[PDB]
Design an enzyme around this catalytic site. Structure first.
Site, mmCIF file in Angstrom:
data_model
loop_
_atom_site.group_PDB
_atom_site.id
_atom_site.type_symbol
_atom_site.label_atom_id
_atom_site.label_comp_id
_atom_site.label_asym_id
_atom_site.label_seq_id
_atom_site.Cartn_x
_atom_site.Cartn_y
_atom_site.Cartn_z
ATOM 1 N N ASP A 49 0.813 -1.202 0.000
ATOM 2 C CA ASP A 49 0.000 0.000 0.000
ATOM 3 C C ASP A 49 0.845 1.248 0.000
ATOM 4 O OD1 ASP A 49 -2.968 1.102 0.557
ATOM 5 O OD2 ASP A 49 -1.566 2.221 1.775
ATOM 6 N N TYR A 54 2.655 10.317 -0.318
ATOM 7 C CA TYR A 54 3.669 9.817 0.588
ATOM 8 C C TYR A 54 5.092 10.139 0.116
ATOM 9 C CZ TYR A 54 -0.127 6.803 2.332
ATOM 10 O OH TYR A 54 -1.327 6.307 2.808
ATOM 11 N N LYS A 82 -2.962 5.800 -4.622
ATOM 12 C CA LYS A 82 -4.054 6.702 -4.279
ATOM 13 C C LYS A 82 -3.966 8.022 -5.022
ATOM 14 C CE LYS A 82 -4.061 4.813 0.431
ATOM 15 N NZ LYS A 82 -2.648 4.459 0.598
ATOM 16 N N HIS A 115 -7.923 9.327 -2.201
ATOM 17 C CA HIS A 115 -7.169 9.405 -0.940
ATOM 18 C C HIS A 115 -8.037 10.026 0.167
ATOM 19 C CE1 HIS A 115 -2.740 9.557 0.605
ATOM 20 N NE2 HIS A 115 -3.556 9.468 1.640
#
Ligand SMILES: NC(=O)c1ccc[n+]([C@@H]2O[C@H](COP(=O)([O-])OP(=O)(O)OC[C@H]3O[C@@H](n4cnc5c(N)ncnc54)[C@H](OP(=O)(O)O)[C@@H]3O)[C@@H](O)[C@H]2O)c1
Length: 314
Positions: A49, A54, A82, A115
């Site tokens: 994931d 990020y 996402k 997200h």
């Protein structure tokens, strides 16, 4: 539900399988490549994931590449990414996916998620200033995500950080319903409400922050530790197994090899009903991730408190 062996899995509405345990990568930093390769090649993980926001997708990409070069097929892996808030407009969906696929060095994603259900302006701050949280064309964004599925660039689509009301709004207009709803879930924040709503619609639930995240880590909770010692397991293993018994997949994050190996050894044993009930018995106080610093502007709005982010459903 399950698959059996450490190849345990859940079944999505499309017939595709999602491995029960995945590697989280938020805040994995410059170790990400190593952690991904280790988790897949040494610990037998088949689910990773990640997300564009990020900032680790290039690293995840190098890790996935190394793992596959050692004789693991792409089909056997389950990769989630996402779509970020700034790209939640119809015409930004496809370019955002292409960038993600390029950084990951992949040709398709197994799962692509919204997200957060909130559009942010370009160059938005934390907290957001006036006029930086924009109006969300949810229907139009989702239509474009359906197009990704049709083209074969994404195998399944889904959402994160939804409410029951936002789910109903989506389910009204959607042709392809969300395969997955990814939510903060752990002892102390079960969010049974969203879980039941997902169960009703046949939507699979992935528990994020299953250990309570860094902020409220539950691995030294008295009750968790008591159960752990009783069953001769680690607190992490108990927290993760608790989630599997509730029927959610889990995506625990770690940058330490030994914890990565530990976190997937949660099959072929169970938490007894009394201990399970005790862990569920922990009261749902507060969530770790409120979305306040992302979407709440107290003075000007449009969201003036954290409860408005969650449609007053807490
Ligand atoms: N959709 C969303 O908006 C959303 C939000 C939050 C998270 N997520 C996803 O969910 C993943 C997991 O959530 P999370 O990263 O917030 O936290 P988490 O997995 O609940 O907790 C990870 C923390 O616990 C530590 N840890 C890991 N295994 C452990 C063990 N066996 N014993 C004791 N401590 C352990 C880790 O430290 P070390 O790393 O130092 O080992 C890290 O500090 C994220 O990586 C991300 O992929 C998604």
């Amino acid at each position: 539900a399950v698959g059996q062996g450490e190849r345990g899995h859940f079944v999505l509405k499309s017939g595709h399988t999602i491995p029960a345990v995945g590697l989280g990568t938020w805040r994995a930093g410059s170790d990400t490549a190593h952690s991904v390769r280790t988790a897949i090649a040494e610990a037998g993980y088949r689910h990773v994931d990640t997300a564009a926001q990020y900032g680790v997708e290039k690293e995840v990409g190098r890790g996935l590449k190394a793992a596959m070069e050692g004789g693991i097929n792409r089909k056997d892996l389950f990769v989630t990414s996402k779509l970020w808030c700034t790209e939640l407009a119809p015409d930004r969906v496809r370019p955002a996916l292409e960038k993600t696929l390029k950084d990951l060095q992949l040709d398709y994603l197994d799962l692509y998620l919204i997200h957060w259900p909130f559009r942010l302006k370009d160059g938005a701050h934390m907290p957001p200033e006036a006029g930086e949280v924009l109006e969300l064309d949810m229907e139009g964004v989702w239509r474009e995500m359906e197009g990704l599925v049709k083209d074969g660039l994404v195998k399944d689509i889904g959402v994160c950080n939804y409410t029951v009301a936002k789910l109903n709004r989506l389910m009204r207009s959607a042709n392809v319903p969300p395969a997955v709803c990814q939510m903060e879930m752990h002892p102390g924040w079960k969010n049974d409400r969203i879980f039941e709503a997902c169960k009703k619609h046949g939507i699979h639930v992935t528990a994020y922050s299953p250990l309570g995240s860094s902020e409220k880590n539950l691995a030294h909770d008295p009750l968790v530790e008591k159960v752990a010692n009783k069953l001769d397991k680690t607190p992490g293993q108990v927290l993760l197994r608790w989630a599997l018994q509730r029927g959610t997949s889990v995506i625990p994050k770690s940058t330490r090899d030994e914890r990565i190996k530990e976190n997937i050894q949660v099959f072929g044993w169970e938490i007894p009903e009394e201990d399970f009930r005790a862990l569920c018995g922990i009261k749902d106080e507060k969530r770790v991730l409120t979305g306040e610093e992302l979407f709440v502007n107290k003075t000007h709005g449009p969201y003036k408190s954290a409860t408005e982010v969650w449609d007053h459903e807490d």
